[PDB]
């Protein structure tokens, strides 16, 4: 995941289909390997004793001040507008710096994000629409106007900006604990049938 060339945007990210395997728990990030260190939903080390059905390698590029906003049930500038984690999210969110990888000459303006929306996003819901919608309590009614905010914004990924506006590549450990028959487990020894 971290050895890839580049990642996609926050709304049309390139995920990897992960099923019927055991993740590499031999060499991972525990003692603050990257900048972001956040886990939500369940106990942060209850991953090997539990099995997960649908695992997706959701990777997108955000700013420095938006790496802690990806959390289930937590508001933010990109959580309720771009990507909402489901209620059964059992993984963690951890990002590293990519200022010398995703930048270019003049700035990379190919990454965009939605800032405002009419309603909050559902659990496990995504949208790639770039049209103008209702910003907040006052709708724009088509074109941008009537004292409304502009939803569709662009990232200022420039190499001469501050550290808080640097591009950060994220990896979302989308371990979903559902009632479906699970496919991905941990490196543990299961018991027999009693």
């Amino acid at each position, epitope marked *: 995941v971290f050895n890839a060339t580049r990642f996609a945007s926050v709304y049309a990210w390139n995920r990897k289909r992960i099923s019927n395997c055991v993740a590499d728990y*031999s*060499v991972l990030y525990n003692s*603050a*390997s990257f900048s972001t260190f956040k886990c939500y939903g369940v106990s942060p*080390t209850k991953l090997n004793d539990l099995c997960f059905t649908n695992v997706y390698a959701d990777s997108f590029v955000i700013r420095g001040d938006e790496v802690r906003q990806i959390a289930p049930g937590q508001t933010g500038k990109i959580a309720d507008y771009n990507y909402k984690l489901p209620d059964d999210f059992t993984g963690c969110v951890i990002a*590293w710096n990519s200022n*010398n990888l995703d930048s270019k000459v003049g700035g990379n303006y190919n990454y965009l994000y939605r800032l405002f929306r009419k309603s909050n996003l559902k659990p496990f819901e995504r949208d790639i629409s770039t049209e103008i919608y209702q910003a907040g309590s006052t709708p724009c009614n088509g074109v941008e106007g009537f004292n409304c905010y502009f939803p569709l914004q662009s990232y200022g990924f420039q190499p001469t900006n*501050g550290v808080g506006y640097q591009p950060y590549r994220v990896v979302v450990l989308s371990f979903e604990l559902l009632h479906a028959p699970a496919t991905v487990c941990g490196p543990k020894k299961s018991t027999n049938l009693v």
Partner: antibody, heavy 118, light 108 residues
Framework: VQLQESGPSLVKPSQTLSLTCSVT????????WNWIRKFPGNKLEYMGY???????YYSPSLKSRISITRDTSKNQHYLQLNSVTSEDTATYYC?????????????WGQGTTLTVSS | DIVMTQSHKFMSTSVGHRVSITCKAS??????VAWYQQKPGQSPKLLIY???TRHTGVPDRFTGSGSGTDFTLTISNVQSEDLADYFC?????????FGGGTKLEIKR
């Protein structure tokens, strides 16, 4: 390799603190060099590192007041600590990442004492 | 921000017992646990790398293991010269951000 810490010991606040750690033994072609700060009171805060290819990372303890540069032809590493204060008075050290003989090694330098006051 | 949750800053022990220093982190690595050691008045030196070997000048009593949340530094037959600063770090991914810290003392 072996590092040697250096730099001015009298830096006024709200300025730029510069340091110099020279590499002796090999040029900057392979390996990694980091910068650490040793605070009194059983504390050791990590700042960051730089690589030979140009990629660098920063610790999340400082928001936007940490920058590390280097020079390949001079075999020296630099630390640029912006917005210094009286609480940043600590002991500086320089380390180097090295692998060999099926073991990991992290060599240390000499160390210097820098005092920041107005 | 890095949140290194620890029980106590100063841990009390005795000569001949087992030192229990646990870095209660909210993640897991596997078989790559690293520890540091800094004597008072000396330079910080490497103590534990790759959770199976030791550095030059390190005795055989310094070892580290653990799984999941609790990574416990194991020191068997701790002498009076083992009063040093211990920090939690890794050597898998960059940067190598350290931990909180733990200072030892002898309970009398």
């Amino acid at each position: 390799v072996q590092l040697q810490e250096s730099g001015p010991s009298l830096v006024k606040p709200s300025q730029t603190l510069s340091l110099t750690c020279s590499v002796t033994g090999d040029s900057i072609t392979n390996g990694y060099w980091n910068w650490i700060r040793k605070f009194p009171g059983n504390k050791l805060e990590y700042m960051g590192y730089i690589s030979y290819s140009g990629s660098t990372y920063y610790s999340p303890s400082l928001k936007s007041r940490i920058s590390i540069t280097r020079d390949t032809s001079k075999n020296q590493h630099y630390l640029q600590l912006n917005s210094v204060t009286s609480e940043d008075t600590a002991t500086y050290y320089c380390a180097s990442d090295y692998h060999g003989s099926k073991y990991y090694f992290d060599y240390w330098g000499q160390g210097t004492t820098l005092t920041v006051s107005s | 921000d890095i949140v290194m949750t620890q029980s106590h800053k100063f841990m009390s022990t005795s000569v001949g017992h087992r030192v229990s220093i646990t870095c209660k982190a909210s993640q897991d690595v596997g078989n790559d646990v690293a520890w540091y050691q800094q004597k008072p008045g000396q330079s910080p030196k490497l103590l534990i790398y790759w959770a199976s070997t030791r550095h030059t000048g390190v005795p055989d009593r310094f070892t580290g293991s653990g799984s999941g949340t609790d990574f416990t530094l194991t020191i068997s037959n701790v002498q009076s010269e083992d009063l040093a600063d211990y920090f939690c770090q890794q050597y898998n991914r960059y940067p190598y951000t350290f931990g909180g810290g733990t200072k030892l003392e002898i309970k009398r």
